[PDB]
């Protein structure tokens, strides 16, 4: 089925995470994708999204919180990625209110 | 063409689905990847345009909306990339 | 465990001595490497940010860490120090 | 020890002459060459990227850094670890 350690290629950027991390939030997109798929030339699971911003999506899946770098200029772009991956609580955290 | 296309746009590696590249008929990427084009030393397809800006061309192909970084200063340069890639709806969104 | 441990931290490859990983008792890496998930190449896998682990590793080596000039991820590194259960490093980053 | 020493510094592979490693008496590398990885290479448990500049200071007893180098402080700490006081002085 799916291995314990999943190797991902997100729009060109390589990430490794546990399968449990990907299915940690029920009804989210990654949960739908990895609940029992396109692959690159090296056999890694492919996600057709911005690879740089996935770093922060992955940390939110790990902790259900994310600390961003100082003066992070892509808060809005990250919010769009959070919408795509269907992470409403992350979407809310990146909204000023 | 493979399901997952490996691209090098001005020194930067970008991977996307073949369906993303041919999503807009009569555009340049649709003409390029419709079933004899340049390849780099690693056999990956090469595009000689701004590497940083292709990132936003690619996200328009994926979402068909334009989300740019906060305080983005290169809006004019990107419009000329959208003209080059023949994406009239993106050109309109950047005016 | 071998004398030289090969690690894959969220996609980034690191090599360190086994003694470095178990240098701080009751920390997470000490709990992990005291006598485990592996990647496709057989390296020990840690499901954390691979870029920040560089500074976690240097703190394990020196019990102090010098950061690059104008380092914008002090907050992120502090969270990693909390996860790896290194309280003195958490204190140094506050 | 062979004439050409193969090193693995925290994941980064470097090759240097044995004479380069023992060029500065009472330094750490001098003490070491007066643990091995899975491939039999001598292992140094330090930052692999910064070793590049430690190695060039050992070769030329001076080091030119890249323009706008942001790790002068980190390199100075590596120079302290390897016990190269003249390198520490030139990085202050």
């Amino acid at each position: 089925s799916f291995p314990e350690v999943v190797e991902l290629n997100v729009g060109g950027q390589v990430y490794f995470t546990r399968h449990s991390t990907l299915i940690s939030i029920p009804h989210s997109l990654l949960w739908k994708m990895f609940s029992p798929l396109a692959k690159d030339s090296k056999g890694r699971f492919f996600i057709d999204r911005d690879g740089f911003l996935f770093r922060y999506i992955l940390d939110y899946l790990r902790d259900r919180q994310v600390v961003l770098p100082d003066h992070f200029p892509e808060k809005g772009r990250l919010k769009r990625e959070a919408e795509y991956f269907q992470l409403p609580d992350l979407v809310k955290l990146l909204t000023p209110d | 063409f493979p399901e997952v296309v490996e691209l090098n746009v001005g020194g930067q590696v970008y991977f996307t689905r073949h369906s993303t590249l041919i999503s807009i008929p009569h555009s340049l990427l649709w003409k390029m990847f419709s079933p004899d084009l340049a390849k780099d030393s690693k056999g990956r397809f090469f595009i000689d345009r701004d590497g940083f800006l292709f990132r936003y061309i690619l996200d328009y192909l994926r979402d068909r909306q334009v989300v740019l970084p906060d305080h983005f200063p290169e809006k004019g340069r990107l419009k000329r990339e959208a003209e080059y890639f023949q994406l009239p709806d993106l050109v309109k969104l950047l005016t | 465990f071998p004398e030289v441990v090969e690690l894959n931290v969220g996609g980034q490859v690191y090599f360190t001595r086994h003694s470095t990983l178990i240098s701080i008792p009751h920390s997470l890496l000490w709990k992990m490497f005291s006598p485990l998930a592996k990647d496709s190449k057989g390296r020990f896998f840690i499901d954390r940010d691979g870029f920040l682990f560089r500074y976690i590793l240097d703190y394990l080596r020196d019990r102090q860490v010098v950061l690059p000039d104008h380092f914008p991820e002090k907050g992120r590194l502090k969270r990693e120090a909390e996860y790896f259960q290194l309280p003195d490093l958490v204190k140094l980053l506050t | 020890f062979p004439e050409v020493v193969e090193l693995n510094v925290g994941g980064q592979v470097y090759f240097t002459r044995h004479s380069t490693l023992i060029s500065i008496p009472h330094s750490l590398l001098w003490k070491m060459f007066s643990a091995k990885d899975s491939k039999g290479r001598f292992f140094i448990d330090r930052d692999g990227f910064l070793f590049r500049y430690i190695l060039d200071y050992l070769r030329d007893r001076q080091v030119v850094l890249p323009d706008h180098f942001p790790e002068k402080g980190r390199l100075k700490r590596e120079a302290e670890y390897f016990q190269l006081p003249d390198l520490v002085k030139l990085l202050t």
């Binding site: 740089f52 | 590497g51 990132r55 | 980034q12 490859v13 991820e73 | -």
Partner: peptide, 12 residues
């Protein structure tokens, strides 16, 4: 090219 974290984070 050095995008975002890549600019200041050398790795792998």
């Amino acid at each position: 090219l050095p995008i975002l974290h890549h600019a200041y984070l050398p790795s792998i």
